[PDB]
Design a protein that fits this description.
about 210 residues, alpha/beta, six-stranded parallel sheet, signal, carbohydrate metabolism, polysaccharide degradation, secreted, acetylxylan esterase activity
Length: about 210
């Protein structure tokens, strides 16, 4: 039976199968909405390490974009009136960003610039939370955080996401991968830092 709300979570590179650091927000949504359900996007979440199956970051990202699209598109067709929440942490944010906003991922060789979610799926995505997304580029309307630069896969100047209004994407200045800072620890802390903001946004969008 379809739930009223369903969440998809995508983990960061090398995280064990499941949600990884997307868990904070996924769990926040599930606890805010009893009866809601969640699934993890089971993409490689790899950067060449054997532990995660050896796929390069480029291959991992490409497979992740397709995995997000397939999972979300198929679930939407199964459950067309279910509101969808996306949560992606670091590489998991990147794959959701491409899938939802399109634009490709040129540094990763992901050449197709189309939105990968179906029209119906885009409409039922009501909130998408990205944390530590390497495609962060300061100046987009859907971004939050102290990062005034951008990450190693940053969107170009002048980018727009058709689904901007559905997104919050978080990144701080000191992060060396979504921003151009120097302290990797910042990259790991967005659940605690921004989880309440993210949940507030989700609740505002879901009702």
């Amino acid at each position: 039976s379809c739930p009223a709300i369903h969440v998809f979570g995508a983990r960061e590179t090398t995280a064990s199968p499941g949600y990884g650091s997307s868990s904070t927000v996924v769990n926040g949504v599930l606890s805010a909405y009893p009866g809601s359900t969640a699934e993890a996007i089971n993409y490689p979440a790899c950067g060449g390490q054997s532990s995660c199956g050896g796929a390069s970051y480029s291959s991992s990202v490409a497979q992740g974009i397709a995995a997000v699209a397939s999972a979300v598109n198929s679930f939407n067709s199964q459950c067309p009136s279910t509101k969808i929440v996306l949560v992606g942490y670091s590489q998991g944010g990147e794959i959701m960003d491409v899938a939802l906003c399109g634009g490709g991922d040129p540094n990763q060789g992901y050449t197709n610039t189309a939105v990968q979610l179906s029209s119906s799926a885009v409409n039922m995505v009501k909130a998408a939370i990205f944390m530590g997304d390497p495609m962060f580029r300061a100046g987009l309307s859907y971004e939050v955080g102290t990062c005034a630069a951008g990450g190693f896969d940053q969107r170009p100047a002048g980018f727009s996401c058709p689904s901007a209004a559905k997104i919050k994407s978080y990144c701080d200045a000191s992060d060396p991968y979504c921003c151009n800072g120097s302290n990797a620890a910042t990259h790991q802390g967005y659940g605690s830092e921004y989880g309440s903001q993210a949940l507030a946004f989700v609740k505002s969008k879901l009702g």
